[PDB]
C-alpha cells in the first residue's frame, strides 16, 4: 500500500 515518490509512483503491494 505504500506509494513512494517516483515517477512513475511506485506503489508497493502493502
Same mark, same amino acid.
Given at each position: 500500500g505504500?506509494?513512494?515518490?517516483?515517477? #512513475? #509512483?511506485?506503489?508497493?503491494?502493502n
Amino acid at each position: 500500500g505504500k506509494c513512494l515518490f517516483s515517477n #512513475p #509512483p511506485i506503489c508497493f503491494p502493502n
